[PDB]
Amino acid sequence: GEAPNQALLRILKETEFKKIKVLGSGTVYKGLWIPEGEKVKIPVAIKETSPKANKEILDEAYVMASVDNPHVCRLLGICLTSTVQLIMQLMPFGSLLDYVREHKDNIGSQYLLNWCVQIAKGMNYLEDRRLVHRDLAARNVLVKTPQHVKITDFGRAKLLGAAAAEYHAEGGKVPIKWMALESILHRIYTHQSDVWSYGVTVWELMTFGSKPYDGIPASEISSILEKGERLPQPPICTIDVYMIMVKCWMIDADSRPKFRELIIEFSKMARDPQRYLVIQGDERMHLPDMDDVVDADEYLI
Numbered sequence: 001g002e003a004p005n006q007a008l009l010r011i012l013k014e015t016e017f018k019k020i021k022v023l024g025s026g027t028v029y030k031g032l033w034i035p036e037g038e039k040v041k042i043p044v045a046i047k048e049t050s051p052k053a054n055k056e057i058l059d060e061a062y063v064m065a066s067v068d069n070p071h072v073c074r075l076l077g078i079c080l081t082s083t084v085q086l087i088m089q090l091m092p093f094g095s096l097l098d099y100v101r102e103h104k105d106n107i108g109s110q111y112l113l114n115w116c117v118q119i120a121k122g123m124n125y126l127e128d129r130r131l132v133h134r135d136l137a138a139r140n141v142l143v144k145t146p147q148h149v150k151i152t153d154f155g156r157a158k159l160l161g162a163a164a165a166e167y168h169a170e171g172g173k174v175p176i177k178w179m180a181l182e183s184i185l186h187r188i189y190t191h192q193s194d195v196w197s198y199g200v201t202v203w204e205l206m207t208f209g210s211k212p213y214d215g216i217p218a219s220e221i222s223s224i225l226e227k228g229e230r231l232p233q234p235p236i237c238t239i240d241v242y243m244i245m246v247k248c249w250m251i252d253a254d255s256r257p258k259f260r261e262l263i264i265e266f267s268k269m270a271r272d273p274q275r276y277l278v279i280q281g282d283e284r285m286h287l288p289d290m291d292d293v294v295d296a297d298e299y300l301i
């Protein structure tokens with residue numbers, strides 16, 4: 001079959017961490033984790049009740065605990081109290097979707113193209129691990145620092161079985177406007193359907209947070225795409241960047257780019273960013289007790 005998953009699932013004591021504030025709901029807290037007698041304090045986000053509810057949060061914990069890459073969020077541990085809590089690395093600047101919205105006027109081309117490279121590295125890693133994310137979107141990329149983003153939200157993620165490289169889903173609330181056409185029609189998901197979502201994600205970034213197909217009810221989307229419509233070329237995008245996006249949206253899934261090629265193409269563009277994104281004012285912009293604080297990326301096993 002396949003290789004044994006020897007990731008370790010760390011069980012954390014409720015006494016080891018302190019909730020500090022609410023960051024979100026739709027419920028994530030900001031907080032501090034102090035492993036018992038280690039002289040470290042680790043900034044964390046804590047994400048908190050039916051029996052199917054905990055069935056799903058544990059599936060996410062399974063996936064999040066099994067990944068280890070600079071451009072994906074890993075589970076630090078879980079806490080098994082009255083309710084199941086995921087303990088994750090604090091990503092201080094929020095989701096990239098909110099970040100590009102709140103900072104339109106000081107995001108230059110170098111940041112945009114580097115984010116594209118980093119997300120492609122994260123997704124290439126997930127493909128190496130035979131993982132299909134199925135929910136890639138700018139809301140699901142977090143900002144550790146403005147120069148370092150990570151992919152998160154594995155609530156739909158699916159490890160491809162030993163043999164077949166395709167997942168068949170059931171119904172539910174699905175993110176239609178980020179999905180390959182073959183997924184909307186036949187509930188088929190592959191790494192190449194993640195490439196489609198990558199293209200939409202890149203389009204969200206190049207429009208500084210626009211909503212894709214804004215106003216169009218999702219029931220219409222499958223027919224729009226069948227007619228050949230796609231998202232429009234964002235004003236800052238040269239044809240070189242827009243052609244990459246459009247290639248992510250081909251009907252033939254095998255004709256879309258591979259993540260490893262998207263790393264290459266956007267790397268090339270990142271060495272001369274003003275040739276590929278045209279932003280008014282680019283070369284002017286700029287983006288940025290705790291004695292024992294250590295980032296999670298420096299706290300290893």
Ligand SMILES: CC(C)n1c2cc(Nc3ccnc(-c4cnn(S(=O)(=O)C5CC5)c4)n3)ncc2c2c(OCC(F)(F)F)cc(N3CCN(C)CC3)cc21
Pocket residue numbers: 023024028030045047073074088089090091092093094095098139140141142152153154
């Ligand atoms: C919940 C997410 C998006 N979020 C954080 C997540 C993490 N960490 C992590 C690390 C790994 N995985 C997740 C995770 C799992 N699943 N998901 S998710 O929710 O499904 C999906 C995203 C929709 C997220 N979160 N770290 C800080 C923040 C954070 C934040 O930090 C600010 C500070 F605390 F650093 F100062 C501010 C804000 N906001 C700014 C204020 N406005 C009003 C609301 C949004 C959101 C923030």
